[PDB]
Amino acid sequence: FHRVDQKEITQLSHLGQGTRTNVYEGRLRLRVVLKVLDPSHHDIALAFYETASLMSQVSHTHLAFVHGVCVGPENIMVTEYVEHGPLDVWLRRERGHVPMAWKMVVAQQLASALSYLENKNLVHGNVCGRNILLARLGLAEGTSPFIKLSDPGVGLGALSREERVERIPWLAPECLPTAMDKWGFGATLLEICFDGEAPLQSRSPSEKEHFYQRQHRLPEPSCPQLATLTSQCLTYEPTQRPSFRTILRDL
Template identity: 65%
Template structure:
């Protein structure tokens, strides 16, 4: 018997590619819309006590770009792929700064708190047009970054920087719920921009 997995084709591909390729067309409102949709999808998973485990801009797919006048982006959160619980320590270190510090040390600590850390890093990717934080660092440098409990570069918006800092709390229990994150992003959403309220999980 042959098992076949069928996945939906998403025309516009992963978010990180779009952020880099179309950065001259992307507005602040567009970025907030995408971030809010992602927080909504992860809030749904958190309510079900489900962990995604690999939140990053490369795993967010654009079903609609929303770069034309009168339209808005629409995302789908992709399958996480191979869970990092089966990866070696070296492979987990390579996933810094998306993987949470506690999960580098011990994969059995995987929880929704890990998704909050990953969301904070993904939010930075969105802010910085798909640029990957720490991409120039070697694996030992990445490990030391976590060991010293350092912070990643921050966006110029103070409120957004504060939210990312909360997601990147080195104490997992100190990270905000996705409902709180969603509320904060809604309050920060620039007025007059279009957004979809129900993102889809792929």
């Protein structure tokens, strides 16, 4: 990854929070986003650098760009500013008015980005609607949506059990104690089908953990065109999950 000097960046409005981060709009001497890591232990900073490294070594139409990292107790990932923000937020605002054909384009674009990652034997590890950014809305007639899958933030391996429980239903059950992205992908399809209302999201940490410990399965989507696909992706057996080559073909 590229090293960014603090003199080259300007920090503007707070956009929201990530895991152990604060996301701000900014300027790079370009409009960008600044992912400000909380004061952290070296294991966390390392997991943050590993993400910036992974995202700086990849290039795909549906993957967000990483400009670099600015490093005292402050670690800032300088990443792509995407026009319309998170998919989950947009789906809730547009609830009941999002056509099936629009959802199918998003699913295909997401499967495309994940197939590219799969071919290179790389793991994203944080696939959810929140990390899917809308570059184009595709609301006007003769237009379609355009997504950018955001960087996964602090790597999954560096997070606490409490943080992994907070990631349910997107977290693969084998991660509770490349196949994990197939589950993340399936849970994201359900979330898209239910207009940004993910299953179990409202439930308590104890309830979410019990759901996985008791091996319960996630609901079927309201969209029948994705029922088989989500059932195949959301199996507790990682080896039984289809490849993104198969998913992309089946879409």
